[PDB]
Design a protein around this ligand. Structure first.
Ligand SMILES: CCCCCCCCCCCCCCCCCC(=O)OC[C@H](CO[C@@H]1O[C@H](CO[C@H]2O[C@H](CO)[C@H](O)[C@H](O)[C@H]2O)[C@H](O)[C@H](O)[C@H]1O)OC(=O)CCCCCCCCCCCCCCCCC
Ligand code: CLA
Ligand code: CLA
Ligand code: CLA
Ligand code: CLA
Ligand SMILES: CC(C)=CCC/C(C)=C/CC/C(C)=C/CC/C(C)=C/CC/C(C)=C/CC/C(C)=C/CC/C(C)=C/CC/C(C)=C/CC/C(C)=C/CC1=CC(=O)C(C)=C(C)C1=O
Ligand SMILES: CC(C)=CCC/C(C)=C/CC/C(C)=C\CC/C(C)=C/CC/C(C)=C/CC/C(C)=C/CC/C(C)=C/CC/C(C)=C\CC/C(C)=C/CC1=CC(=O)C(C)=C(C)C1=O
Ligand SMILES: CCCCCCCCCCCCCCCCCC(=O)OC[C@H](CO[C@@H]1O[C@H](CO)[C@H](O)[C@H](O)[C@H]1O)OC(=O)CCCCCCCCCCCCCCCCC
Ligand SMILES: CCCCCCCCCCCCCCCC(=O)OC[C@H](COP(=O)(O)OC[C@@H](O)CO)OC(=O)CCCCCCCCCCCCCCC
Ligand code: HEC
Ligand SMILES: CC1=C(/C=C/C(C)=C/C=C/C(C)=C/C=C/C=C(C)/C=C/C=C(C)/C=C/C2=C(C)CCCC2(C)C)C(C)(C)CCC1
Ligand code: OEY
Ligand SMILES: [Cl-]
Ligand SMILES: [Cl-]
Ligand SMILES: [Fe+2]
Lengths: 137, 176, 36, 51, 152, 30, 334, 97, 244, 33, 51, 32
């Protein structure tokens, strides 16, 4: 098996347009996800709130849907709760709160696409392991 | 892979509870103790047989004379520990005997485990614990650990069995 | 309990004083070769 | 209905006879609970004999 | 199906299910077998035949998992109840008996059904006399096991 | 009965320690 | 000939059947306290709430244990690292429920055993011996500190120190493997090399010396009677032993110097056990064994399991089961 | 006559839908728009005699009422089960991942 | 003076309710118009009594004293609730929230440990009619809920539980289950207790009241494994009243 | 506890019989000397 | 009538009712006494009391 | 038959202990 363009193709938006990441973007995405996110989101769970994971199915039922590049890029700029009702930049890393979350300072627009891309690709590779937790280690 | 072997034997065979392993443990730990205590006694009851601060040079393989004082070693250990060796031949035979016997004992226990002839349980404990939900011992706590080991490692450790354990059957304590 | 506490405080102090003053009583001299 | 002599107790009565009536676990053979017998409980007498 | 053949198809006669200090005859453990209860057939509420996964000899304890002919899990007895998907209660598992003492009988009350599922991991299901020898319910090995051990 | 047995064996071992130390065969030089 | 000097002379006398010494003045009461409390607790103590969750664990023989399952149970997690002497309890009943006897035993024992080590120095000095037998005993002593004191310090509670029991010991080492993975830690691997190699060299030395005993007896008598306590001459032929072992392997892998040989005997297990005691003492601060979980993946990114991942599955089973009612939150951080 | 009441409850609608009187709050993530805000409101205002009662929760906006309407078929109500609602278990039932 | 944490910590004072000066014999008048809350109710047990079992014919056993073995972990505090005025002048406290339970285990003579959940959960307690003033003769009497001492995730030592755990004695694979049914099937009890609160001190200025309490409730039944004991608890209380 | 009743005689002879054997050999050794 | 006093008026507590190899406590024989059943009065059909 | 189970150990020790005593005294007589 290998990292093919099929696996590297992911929804860009809710319209149903798609984008094909390069292998480079994917690995950039993975590296930046480790740098900025994995302390809480290792393996696609959320250590400080396990009820909410990074599975595609969960992101799809979020409000604004977050199962696409645009929704996830937006989330990293202006995070909301799962029903969209409340903004949580003060307790969740975002560019909006890069002053209190200093690792977000040096993230460019293309870094965000790469991180979002990693999050949408990884469950295509790992299946249940992504977001499933220790049961699947 | 050997580390996995050890853990397998804990969870499936409860091998730590097996008195043949226990005798093996005593024999290996007892051998190591004998090894350290004999080497240190000799090295700390040496006779002054040269002028150097490096006492190694003052031994000649063809000298007939003992190089350390059995008598002072015997006094030391009698007064420190109550008992000491007094017979050098017995001492060194005992050093052969202890770890050789311990290893032989453990081999016997493993033969039994070839047949799943384990020392897995104490029946008296299980009868009481079944009836009395407030009865708890380190023996019942370790069996819960075994039960976790088996359910959590079997699917991947025994792939030919095609074990599919859904999340809802995995034994788990609270939160973890 | 306070009586037990006091008793143990006294007993421990006793043994520790014995230890300290015993080693201060010329202990290097108490060997079989050279004494001072 | 279940006093010491129904239970095959043989030395317990000789301690009770001369004034030892209570256990460090808080019962006495007269049925009063929460007594504090001090050292000279049934247990203290036994320990003393062992020592 | 002769009872003698059914009784061979039961893990309690497997000699690798004993223990070193579990002494005496096999009868002292599971009891004196009296009768084959019959062959248990499990079905869910949709009528698929389900199959209890049998205990392997390696395991002192084993969970209760039911499969379809294809090996797909369709029911179990859950440990954690809050997120259970496959409970007997949810799947409407039932058991029917063909042959033996319970032939032609069907049970639907989930606790009875789970009870036979717990026995089906051992193979075929027998009625035992546990009183006569005050059997403790824990498997012992057979003369085949004791002889091999001693001679090895 | 099992408790009595365990403690009896333990006490016999302690007693053996006592004889083994104070009533040993004395080591005698040559 | 004053009262003190007479006392000092009895304390340090080399005529006492058992040497007392100044370290003995502390060792004797502390060991007697630890021993007497240990025997009574093991036989008759009531159940102890080791994990502070009002779930008492029965450890004594009268409350339904045998020799293998019995233990003196560690003090309550509710106490953590607080000092819990008797006079701090409202009653003995309280002290027993919360695990007081454990603290009394381990503190007296560690004190007594530290003094045991010093007493080995002291008597060596009085007898005009070289001094370092006590350094060999520092390896076991360090190991006892690690499981009774250092590990409880790092984790925050004497409730995670090793139980004073046979099955309690096993519980301790199983839960240690799930929380630390001692097996994949190199200091434990060196401890194994220290005790396996220690047993090996014990057998080797014993068999080589026993192999080369000089004929001094008939076949109707124990060959041990060919050695007399205090004889000046060696009782075996080291050149014959060396001539055998150097041919078994090759010449230069065999000792011809008995002093180097016995130093090696001393050094290998002592040093290996130093490392394993330091393993426990550093996993006390959670610097754990190697983690190669999901380290191998394929071109696509699928995880390719190794035997380390199989170890991880077993560790997970120990983790999720231990102290099954004691965790309310997802991470078992101590 | 000795029955496990949680297992019994799995044989009701509680075993197939979100039970507005008993189910832990994390189940409301299964449907969009429900967590955390409406889920918090629903759990605080239980018990309910019928699934439709949820629409009378004081405070709902029209958007909230419409979200509930879209999801009424995913809900049920059964009798409150003490074992499921004591201990604050509707907010944290000790299950994480 | 008001103490700080570092004054209190390790002393035992954190487990004690506030007291009032013995000078505090006033009265706090109630406006049937106005609404009120209790901003803090504190209950400090001092004595745990357990009913013995007389065994012989109907002798009716006594309440015997016990020793506390779980230390200074016993007090209920920071309890709050509505204080309502009813048509007939009676006042009713309705507990809303607070640290309103503590597990306790006391030890009877002979060594039996008795755990209990000391609680006032869901307390509703009410005065006589025609109060109009809270005084040093005012009594509140009420009833509260006693949930199971362990909640549903609790696993016994063989792994059996109610919402989690094994449903059988797995260590006895072929034992007859009938005899084990009581140990195997966990049940969640919910019983009621009764309390009386007796007001003996009142600070008319500050809305603080204090006095004595006695409650009666059931002990732990280990999820149905054994019959509970009756427990009688006595202690002191403190409560602070506020107009809402 | 419901222990094996025969464990007691098993343990008793396991201690007694080899111990007696040793004592017999010891005592007749002393009375040679 | 106090139970304790009835219990003394019962031959199972008479020490001359035993056996040399009947071992153990009295409770091993008749059992553990739990309750006085009451004093039995016997009458024939003429209502005359019998003993 | 419902016999007393301490009967077995009581009979075994009643035989063993005094028998062993005599055997000890006899063997050490022969070797002297
Ligand atoms: C080998 C060779 C070397 C030779 C060495 C020399 C050999 C000599 C060895 C001596 C060994 C002594 C053995 C000591 C046993 C410890 C007994 C104990 O702990 O016994 C303690 C008893 C136990 O007390 C009772 O303890 C009970 C404990 O109950 C527990 O135990 C109960 C009974 O088993 C039940 O189990 C019950 O359910 C369970 O809760 C209850 O709590 C009672 O309330 C409580 O009274 O206490 C008592 O009353 C005792 C008195 C204490 C009074 C308190 C005042 C303080 C007195 C200070 C005295 C210090 C001693 C002086 C130091 C020396 C100075 C010169
Ligand atoms: C205090 C801890 C402790 C101690 C001291 C021991 C001690 C022992 N264990 Mg136990 N064990 C423990 C804890 C412990 N155990 C725990 C907690 C568990 C979990 C249940 C186990 C599980 C366990 C298992 C599962 C087994 C043991 C076994 C053993 C024995 C190993 C004997 C040996 O040297 O084999 C070493 C191997 C040999 C001596 C075989 C021959 C080796 C030849 C000579 C090798 C030659 C090498 C050659 C030159 C090439 C090397 C080159 C290359 C490396 C570069 C010994 C009695 C084994 C046993 O009982 O065996 C019968 C066994 O199988 N243990
Ligand atoms: C090859 C030998 C052999 C075999 C395979 C069997 C097998 C069997 N026998 Mg038979 N039996 C034998 C010899 C044998 N017997 C002999 C010689 C006797 C006379 C003593 C008997 C007397 C006998 C009776 C009276 C009964 C049986 C019964 C049975 C059955 C149950 C066995 C059991 O529970 O064991 C339990 C086995 C163990 C617990 C293993 C003990 C291992 C010891 C503890 C190890 C010792 C270790 C040692 C001290 C370490 C030293 C090391 C170091 C110091 C050097 C089984 C089919 C029973 C039955 O079911 O009958 C119908 C029964 O009641 N047997
Ligand atoms: C060499 C003698 C010796 C030593 C060093 C200790 C040391 C100790 N004992 Mg032990 N003890 C001893 C003899 C000794 N004991 C004897 C003879 C008895 C019987 C009377 C006891 C009975 C006893 C009890 C009953 C308890 C202790 C406790 C203690 C601990 C605290 C003591 C303390 O607070 O000191 C305070 C005094 C000082 C620090 C003075 C320092 C002096 C400098 C000048 C400590 C581990 C307690 C314990 O283990 O808590 C867990 C406890 O509960 N001891
Ligand atoms: C003055 C001595 C004395 C007395 C009166 C008692 C009395 C009692 N004990 Mg105690 N006991 C004693 C000494 C005594 N004991 C001693 C020394 C021990 C230690 C071994 C015990 C151990 C003990 C235990 C363990 C128990 C008792 C119990 C009891 C009760 C039941 C007794 C019973 O069933 O006897 C049965 C008596 C017999 C069967 C008589 C045996 C006589 C035979 C025939 C031997 C003599 C024959 C001899 C070989 C002839 C050789 C002649 C030759 C020269 C020709 C009773 C209150 C029991 C009880 O209920 O406690 C709660 C119990 O369980 N006792
Ligand atoms: C109150 C209650 C009941 C308490 C009980 C508590 C309880 C938990 C008790 C546990 C009991 C329990 C069951 C113990 C387990 C024991 C067990 C596993 C038994 C193993 C038995 C056994 C047959 C195993 C087979 C292997 C075997 C042969 C091992 C033997 C090990 C052993 C004895 C090693 C020697 C140890 C040792 C301390 C030696 C010191 C020797 C010594 C004095 C050397 C000094 C010395 C050195 C020199 O170099 C010279 C020159 C001189 C002169 C000299 O002197
Ligand atoms: C297609 C085709 C045809 C295929 C080609 C294949 C082919 C044909 C194959 C054939 C191969 C062939 C022709 C043969 C040659 C092969 C060959 C070289 C084989 C190598 C085999 C090999 C692996 C050997 C094992 C080596 C071995 C394990 C030794 C390692 C050394 C070792 C660990 C030694 C221990 C030393 C040590 C630490 C100390 C000893 C311990 C100890 C302290 C002893 C105590 C002690 C010591 C004393 O000293 C004396 C005095 C006394 C008192 C005493 O107490
Ligand atoms: C005189 C010397 C004899 C005294 C020496 C000490 C006796 C030691 C006894 C050890 C066995 C005790 C085990 C407990 C058995 C008992 O209590 O139950 C008694 C058990 C029988 O079991 C009884 O059976 C009954 C129905 O018949 C009931 O079921 C009882 O419940 C059950 O206990 O006895 C045995 O089966 C013993 C015989 C077994 C011997 C064969 C085993 C061969 C194993 C190979 C061993 C090789 C290892 C060599 C090591 C090197
Ligand atoms: C610090 C205060 C003192 C501490 C107290 C110490 C007490 C323990 C000392 C052992 C006495 C018993 C040994 C008798 C036996 C005895 O007298 O041996 C004496 C023996 C003396 O040997 P010699 O060389 O004189 O004799 C050999 C010739 O006679 C050939 O026949 O020494 C040994 O063999 C050494 C190895 C014994 C190794 C065993 C010692 C450790 C055993 C520990 C047992 C623990 C089990 C615990 C169960 C709970
Ligand atoms: C802990 C400090 C976190 C860090 C670092 C990151 N995330 Fe996070 N995340 C965290 C929490 C507690 C939550 C839930 C927020 C809530 O209350 O709703 C989240 C959630 C997300 C989500 C939504 C998942 C869903 O199923 O809807 C996303 C997409 C997400 N987090 C992404 C993300 C990224 C990309 C991060 C690195 C830049 C990152 N998180 C860090 C906690 C933490
Ligand atoms: C003087 C001197 C000396 C000597 C000393 C000694 C000898 C000491 C002793 C000591 C001792 C001898 C000690 C003891 C102690 C002990 C302890 C302290 C104990 C404790 C115990 C306990 C507390 C118990 C408890 C319990 C339990 C646990 C359970 C059951 C119940 C009871 C409660 C009982 C010398 C020589 C050195 C020199 C110098 C001087
Ligand atoms: O391992 Mn897991 O981690 Ca050290 O604490 Mn958290 O749990 Mn508990 O008490 Mn003993 O044990
Ligand atoms: Cl555990
Ligand atoms: Cl936690
Ligand atoms: Fe040597």
């Amino acid at each position: 098996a290998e990292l093919t363009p099929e696996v590297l193709t992911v929804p860009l938006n809710s319209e149903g347009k798609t984008i094909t990441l390069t292998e480079k973007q994917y690995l950039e995405g993975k590296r930046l996800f480790q740098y900025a996110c994995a302390s809480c989101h290792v393996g696609g769970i959320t250590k400080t709130n396990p009820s909410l994971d990074l599975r595609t199915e969960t992101l799809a039922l979020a409000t604004p849907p977050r199962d696409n590049i645009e929704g996830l890029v937006d989330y990293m700029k202006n995070p909301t709760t799962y029903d969209g009702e409340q903004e949580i930049a003060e307790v969740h890393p975002s560019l909006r709160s890069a002053d209190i979350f200093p690792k977000m300072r040096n993230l460019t627009e293309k870094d965000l696409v790469a991180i979002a891309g990693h999050i949408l690709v990884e469950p295509k590779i790992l299946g249940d392991k992504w977001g499933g937790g220790k049961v699947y280690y | 892979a050997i580390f996995r072997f050890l853990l397998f034997f804990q969870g499936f065979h409860n091998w730590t509870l097996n008195p043949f392993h226990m005798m093996g443990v005593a024999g290996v730990l007892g051998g190591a103790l004998l090894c350290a205590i004999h080497g240190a006694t000799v090295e700390n009851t040496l006779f002054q047989d040269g002028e150097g601060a490096s006492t190694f040079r003052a031994f000649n393989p063809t000298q007939a004379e003992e190089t350390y004082s059995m008598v002072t070693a015997n006094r030391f250990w009698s007064q420190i520990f109550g008992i000491a060796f007094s017979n050098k031949r017995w001492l060194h035979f005992f050093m052969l005997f202890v770890p050789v016997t311990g290893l032989w004992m453990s081999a016997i226990g493993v033969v039994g485990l070839a047949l799943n002839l384990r020392s897995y349980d104490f029946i008296s404990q299980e009868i009481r614990a079944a009836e009395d939900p407030e009865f708890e011992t380190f023996y019942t706590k370790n069996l819960l650990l075994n039960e976790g080991i088996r359910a959590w490692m079997a699917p991947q450790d025994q792939p030919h069995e095609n074990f599919v354990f859904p999340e809802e059957v995995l034994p788990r304590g609270n939160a973890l | 309990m306070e009586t037990l506490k006091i008793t143990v405080y006294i007993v421990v102090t006793f043994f520790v004083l014995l230890f300290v003053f015993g080693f201060l009583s010329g202990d290097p001299a108490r060997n079989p070769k050279r004494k001072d | 209905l279940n006093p010491m002599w129904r239970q095959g107790m043989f030395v317990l009565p000789f301690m009770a006879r001369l004034g030892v009536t209570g256990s460090w676990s808080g019962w006495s053979i007269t049925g009063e609970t929460g007594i504090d017998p001090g050292f000279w409980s049934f247990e203290g007498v036994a320990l003393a004999h062992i020592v | 199906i002769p009872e003698k053949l059914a009784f061979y198809d039961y893990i309690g006669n497997n000699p690798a299910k004993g223990g070193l200090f579990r002494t005496g005859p096999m009868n002292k453990g599971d009891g004196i077998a009296q009768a084959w209860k019959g062959h248990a057939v499990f079905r869910n509420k949709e009528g698929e035949e389900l199959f209890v996964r049998r205990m392997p000899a390696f395991f002192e304890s084993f969970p209760v998992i039911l499969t379809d002919k294809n090996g797909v899990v369709k029911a179990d007895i859950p440990f954690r109840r809050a997120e259970s998907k496959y409970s007997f209660e949810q799947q409407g598992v039932t058991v029917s008996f063909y042959g033996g003492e319970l032939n032609g009988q069907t049970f639907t009350d989930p606790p009875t059904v789970k009870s036979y599922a717990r026995k089906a991991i051992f193979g075929e299901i027998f009625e035992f006399d546990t009183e006569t020898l005050n059997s403790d319910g824990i498997f012992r090995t057979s003369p085949r096991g004791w002889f091999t051990f001693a001679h090895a | 009965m099992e408790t009595i047995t365990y403690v009896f064996i333990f006490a016999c071992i302690i007693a053996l320690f006592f004889f083994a130390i104070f009533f040993r065969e004395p080591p005698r030089i040559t | 000939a004053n009262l003190w000097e007479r006392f000092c002379n009895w304390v340090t006398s080399t005529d006492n059947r058992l040497y007392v010494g100044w370290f003995g003045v502390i060792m004797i009461p502390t060991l007697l306290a630890a021993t007497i409390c240990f025997v009574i607790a093991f036989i008759a103590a009531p159940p102890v709430d080791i994990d502070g969750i009002r779930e008492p664990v029965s450890g004594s023989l009268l409350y339904g244990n045998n020799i293998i399952t019995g233990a003196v149970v560690p003090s309550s997690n509710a106490i953590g690292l607080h000092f819990y002497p008797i006079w701090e309890a409202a009653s003995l009943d309280e002290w027993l429920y919360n695990g007081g006897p454990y603290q009394l035993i381990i503190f007296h024992f560690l004190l007594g055993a530290s003094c045991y080590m010093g007493r080995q120095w002291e008597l060596s000095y009085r007898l005009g011996m070289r001094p370092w037998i006590c350094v060999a005993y520092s390896a076991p002593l360090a190991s006892a500190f690690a499981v009774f004191l250092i590990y409880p310090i790092g984790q925050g509670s004497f409730s995670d120190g090793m139980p004073l029991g046979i099955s309690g010991t096993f519980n301790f080492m199983i839960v240690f493997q799930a929380e630390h993975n001692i097996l994949m830690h190199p200091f434990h691997q060196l401890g194994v090399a220290g005790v396996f190699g220690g047993a090996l060299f014990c057998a080797m030395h014993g068999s080589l010396v026993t192999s080369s005993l000089i004929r001094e007896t008939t076949e109707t008598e124990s060959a041990n009677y060919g050695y007399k306590f205090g004889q000046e001459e060696e009782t075996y032929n080291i050149v014959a032993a060396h001539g055998y072992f150097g041919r078994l392997i090759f010449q230069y892998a065999s000792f011809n110097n008995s002093r180097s040989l016995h130093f090696f005997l001393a050094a290998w297990p002592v040093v290996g056990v130093w490392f394993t005691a330091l393993g426990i003492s550093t996993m006390a601060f959670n610097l754990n064994g190697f983690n190669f979980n999901h380290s191998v993946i394929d071109a696509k990114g699928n995880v390719i399991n190794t035997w380390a991942d199989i170890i991880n599955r077993a560790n997970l089973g120990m983790e999720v089961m231990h102290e099954r009612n004691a965790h309310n939150f997802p991470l078992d951080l101590a | 006559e000795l029955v496990n009441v949680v297992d019994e409850k799995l044989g009701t609608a509680y075993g197939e839908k979100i039970d507005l009187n008993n189910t832990n709050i994390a189940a409301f993530i299964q449907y969009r728009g429900l967590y955390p805000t409406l889920a918090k409101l629903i759990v605080k205002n239980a018990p309910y005699e019928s699934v439709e009662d949820v629409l009378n929760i004081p405070g709902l906006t029209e958007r909230q009422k419409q979200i509930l309407r879209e999801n009424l078929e995913h809900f049920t109500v059964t009798e409150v089960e003490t074992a499921l609602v004591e201990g604050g278990d509707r907010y944290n039932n000790g299950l994480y991942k | 003076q008001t103490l700080t944490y570092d004054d209190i910590v390790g002393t035992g004072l954190a487990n004690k309710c506030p007291t009032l000066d013995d000078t505090a014999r006033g009265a706090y008048p109630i406006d049937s118009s106005q609404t009120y809350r209790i901003a803090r109710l504190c209950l400090q047990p001092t004595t745990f009594l357990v009913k013995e079992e007389p065994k012989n014919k109907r002798q009716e056993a006594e309440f015997v004293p016990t020793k506390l073995v779980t230390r200074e972990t016993t007090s209920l505090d920071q309890i709050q609730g509505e204080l309502k005025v009813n048509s007939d002048g009676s006042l009713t406290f309705v507990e809303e929230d607070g640290i309103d339970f503590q597990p306790v285990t006391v030890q009877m003579a002979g060594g039996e440990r008795i755990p209990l959940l000391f609680t006032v959960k869901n307390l509703v307690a009410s005065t006589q009619p025609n109060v109009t003033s809270i005084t040093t003769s005012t009594d509140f009497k009420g009833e509260f809920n006693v949930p199971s001492y362990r909640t549903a995730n609790f696993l016994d030592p063989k792994g059996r539980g109610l919402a989690s755990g094994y449903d059988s004695a797995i260590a006895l694979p072929q034992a007859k289950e009938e005899e084990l049914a009581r140990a195997n099937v966990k049940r969640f009890s919910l019983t009621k207790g009764q309390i009386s609160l007796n007001v003996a001190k009142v600070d008319g200025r500050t809305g603080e009241i204090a006095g004595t309490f006695e409650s009666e409730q059931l002990s732990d039944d280990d999820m149905g494994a054994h019959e509970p004991h009756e427990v009688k608890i006595q202690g002191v209380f403190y409560a602070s009243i506020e107009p809402a | 506890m419901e222990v094996n009743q025969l464990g007691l005689i098993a343990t008793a002879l396991f201690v007694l019989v080899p111990s007696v054997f040793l004592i017999i050999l010891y005592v007749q050794t002393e009375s040679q000397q």
